[PDB]
Design a binder for this molecule. Structure first.
Ligand SMILES: Nc1ncnc2c1ncn2[C@@H]1O[C@H](CSCC[C@H](N)C(=O)O)[C@@H](O)[C@H]1O
Length: 231
């Protein structure tokens, strides 16, 4: 089952086109769901955290963290999605080109609490963005092409400070029922990618089977939230 979607891809241009065409869906209404349920364990009572959001889209959580005094950085290939974030969140921003990455740009809120890099996550190393106390990964790992898991994991690990908390959600479903994204990422895969370098705790497993998965054609859907910290 783990290899069923192994050769399935969406390309960077495919993702940009989903945004252009409005063929992208955001079923996230109050933010996420198990978002706030575990925010306290994630923050571990600290202030002024530097928090990275891979494949951030226009995630409202980025504004929640910024509102609370944390420094937020996101990466998102779609310029359209990034601009929608600032619009939806009613925030002004600047645009600057990225020297190290052809055609790339960074969009930053006017007082700097949110910086959204418009480029591929795989190009981020060249942008010299430093490291992070926290990484928030909802939808990102499960959006990555299965073939690119190791490349993604390596980048994630390279962006972590020595002490960190990395919150990552994965989805369990029958991979023969649905060609991703989101892709099927079993616990075994999360372990393969991060277990050498991170301690792993399952915080919660919930039954996520609902409405729109009627045309997805799924008999079951579980989402598991994991908290990864230094070994
Ligand atoms: N390699 C890549 N680098 C940067 N962004 C990517 C990417 N591959 C996909 N994306 C973007 O990643 C997002 C994946 S969908 C998840 C969006 C967000 N994490 C949320 O839950 O709200 C899309 O907005 C897509 O345009």
């Amino acid at each position: 089952d783990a290899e069923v979607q192994k050769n399935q891809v969406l390309t960077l241009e495919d993702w940009k086109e989903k945004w252009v065409t409005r063929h992208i869906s955001f079923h996230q209404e109050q933010g996420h769901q198990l978002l706030k349920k575990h925010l306290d364990t994630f923050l571990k009572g600290q202030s002024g955290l530097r928090v990275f959001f891979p494949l951030c889209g226009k995630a409202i959580e980025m504004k929640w963290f910024a509102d609370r005094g944390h420094t937020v950085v996101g990466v998102e290939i779609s310029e359209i999605g990034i601009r929608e974030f600032f619009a939806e969140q009613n925030l002004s921003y600047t645009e600057e080109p990225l020297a190290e990455i052809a055609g790339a740009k960074v969009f930053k809120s006017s007082s700097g609490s949110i910086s959204l890099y418009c480029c591929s996550i795989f190009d981020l190393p060249r942008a010299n963005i430093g490291k992070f106390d926290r990484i928030w990964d909802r939808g990102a790992l499960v959006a990555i092409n299965p073939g690119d898991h190791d490349r993604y994991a390596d980048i994630i690990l390279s962006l972590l400070r020595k002490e960190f908390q990395y919150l990552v959600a994965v989805l369990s479903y029958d991979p023969t029922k649905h060609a991703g994204p989101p892709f099927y990422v079993p616990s075994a895969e999360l372990k393969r990618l991060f277990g050498t370098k991170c301690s792993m705790q399952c915080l919660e497993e919930v039954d996520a089977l609902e409405e729109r998965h009627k045309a997805w054609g799924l008999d079951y859907l579980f989402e598991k939230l994991y908290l990864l910290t230094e070994k």
